[PDB]
Design an enzyme around this catalytic site. Structure first.
Site, PDB file in Angstrom:
ATOM      1  N   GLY A  92       2.308   6.704   9.258  1.00  0.00           N
ATOM      2  CA  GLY A  92       3.758   6.655   9.031  1.00  0.00           C
ATOM      3  C   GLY A  92       4.379   5.396   9.620  1.00  0.00           C
TER       4      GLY A  92
ATOM      5  N   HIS B 239       0.847  -1.223   0.000  1.00  0.00           N
ATOM      6  CA  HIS B 239       0.000   0.000   0.000  1.00  0.00           C
ATOM      7  C   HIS B 239       0.875   1.263   0.000  1.00  0.00           C
ATOM      8  CE1 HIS B 239       0.579   0.724   4.197  1.00  0.00           C
ATOM      9  NE2 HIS B 239      -0.412  -0.032   4.681  1.00  0.00           N
TER      10      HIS B 239
ATOM     11  N   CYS C 162       3.420   2.227   9.269  1.00  0.00           N
ATOM     12  CA  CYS C 162       3.306   1.027   8.433  1.00  0.00           C
ATOM     13  C   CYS C 162       4.712   0.584   8.022  1.00  0.00           C
ATOM     14  CB  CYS C 162       2.368   1.254   7.258  1.00  0.00           C
ATOM     15  SG  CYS C 162       0.651   1.553   7.786  1.00  0.00           S
TER      16      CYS C 162
END
Ligand SMILES: N#Cc1ccc(N2CCCOCC2)cn1
Ligand SMILES: N#Cc1ccc(N2CCCOCC2)cn1
Lengths: 304, 304
Positions: B143, B41, B145
């Protein structure tokens, strides 16, 4: 979202841990520049610890009696000295992994990370607070002495604790990195009882703010209070008195959430008087006091 | 003595964290050998995340669109591929700090450490469990991830989790390092509700053993039970069924303490039925389930 008991990343400190052996005693040392810092009781047998005379014990020790091992490589000890309750072993090699660092003496209620070590090898990292009775509630087995507590600001490690002793009540005592014990404790195996372990009120309030930010809001009520009124209740529940300095420190959390500090105090007052009624806040069934206002802002803002 | 929620020392993992940017999206990557692993993603806008076609989005991406930064030094991307829900970015430089490592897919009830990161920079370390509903209860802001979960056995890091998403309930979902989600979750901004967050019974029992070892013994009672009897109570309280495999795994703690597993089950049964009555166990007002039997032995034995 979510709020966890979070330690600082331990890598910068892992790079500083060594093994110190004197005769049959092995514990941990902290290697910064060309100095290794360790508890002075490295020179004691268990027998010695009942009534040690450290100056007298140290006279029988030479540089070559302090065996310092960094991984599987031996460091050459070229000097030693006692400062308060720590030994400083001068070695012939600066630690190449020495981070930017400071030595700080923290106040009760301040939190820090502990890198629990055995034989100079890291085993785990956890978050502690200096309790108002100057104990910490740690996890330390024999061999863990010389494990350290620290904070990090960006790339500077502030070392604030070195582990020295366990009280008969299974709580922990130690020193700053100048070798001064927190509280009244001594490096002797004697009757040392801790005083009242009061709750760090400013930290509970911070954590309640953390709860609101993270969606746990059931405990917010229609009430307010005053510092003096709140403090009557705090006293009854063995909470630290809340000062205007504490109110000032919670200002940013108050601003972020729009809940006046004295309104949160009135929420805490009802929680003290009424209990949790079987409910939880941020996954806890008791009021957590080992997050500082700075901790809550840091974790809620993602500081690295 | 003392028993803490302890994370693994994070240094070996800190040495692997990088920043990955694709267009306007920045998150974290894991740099092992000459591959950087990150959530797929990274290629999505917030708009994309409502109904993303990752194969179609990826066609518009070249190696040079993936900006990989290790500290303040840029890595050259020489290949990319999608595996399940992770991207593998091949870089021209092997990470010189790559530890011994494995990729493992953990079972629910297993615990691990999370190194929470932002912009490739470590912010904190905490201990998690894979919940029985395949969520984790983390602390992750936007932020975060690509932050990872791991265990360490001596010098080998076993990576078991990469952070992908927060559910509307503020619980967390992610993948193993092959890019397969834990549980039914998908990397799409849609209605994903978690199932029942049952209590990890074998972990509660381990922690009760930890309590006994560390002097908290008030909850030990005169009773025993059977697996089937205990399991009737477990079911009523949304505890996982206890199996003979779980009993076998608690054998060493049973041996160390001399408390038969089924006797500890009968203690747990009374705690479920009677509550804590305002008492605490190892500083907790609820029954802790994020320590495995292995965790309790490790921490109670000082493994490094
Ligand atoms: N609490 C405590 C405590 C108990 C023993 C002790 N000694 C020196 C270091 C380890 O060697 C054995 C004797 C130090 N601190
Ligand atoms: N939960 C969740 C979540 C929300 C947004 C998201 N995007 C890709 C990475 C960050 O860029 C913004 C869009 C990913 N995961």
């Amino acid at each position: 979202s979510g709020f966890r008991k979070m330690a600082f990343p331990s890598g910068k400190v892992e790079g500083c841990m060594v093994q110190v052996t004197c005769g049959t005693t092995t514990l941990n040392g902290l290697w910064l520049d060309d100095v290794v810092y360790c508890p002075r009781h490295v020179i004691c047998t268990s027998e010695d610890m009942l009534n040690p005379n450290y100056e007298d014990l140290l006279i029988r020790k030479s540089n070559h009696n302090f065996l310092v091992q960094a991984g599987n490589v031996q460091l050459r000890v070229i000097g030693h000295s006692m400062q308060n309750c720590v030994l400083k072993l001068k070695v012939d090699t600066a630690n190449p992994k020495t981070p930017k660092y400071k030595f700080v003496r923290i106040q009760p209620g301040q939190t820090f990370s502990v890198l629990a070590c055995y034989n100079g090898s890291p085993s785990g990292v956890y978050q502690c607070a200096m309790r108002p009775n100057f104990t910490i509630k740690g996890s330390f087995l024999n061999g863990s002495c010389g494990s350290v507590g620290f904070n990090i600001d960006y790339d500077c490690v502030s070392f604030c604790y070195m582990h020295h002793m366990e009280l008969p009540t299974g709580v922990h005592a130690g020193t700053d990195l100048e070798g001064n014990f927190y509280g009244p404790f001594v490096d002797r195996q004697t009757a040392q009882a801790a005083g009242t372990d009061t709750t760090i009120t400013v930290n509970v309030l911070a954590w309640l703010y953390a709860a609101v930010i993270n969606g746990d809001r059931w405990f917010l009520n229609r009430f307010t209070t005053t510092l003096n009124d709140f403090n009557l209740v705090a006293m009854k529940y063995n909470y630290e008195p809340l000062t205007q300095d504490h109110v000032d420190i919670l200002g940013p959390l108050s601003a972020q959430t729009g809940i006046a500090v004295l309104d949160m105090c009135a929420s805490l007052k009802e929680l003290l008087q009424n209990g949790m009624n079987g409910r939880t806040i941020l996954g806890s069934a008791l009021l957590e006091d080992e997050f500082t206002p700075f901790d809550v802002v840091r974790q809620c803002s993602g500081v690295t």
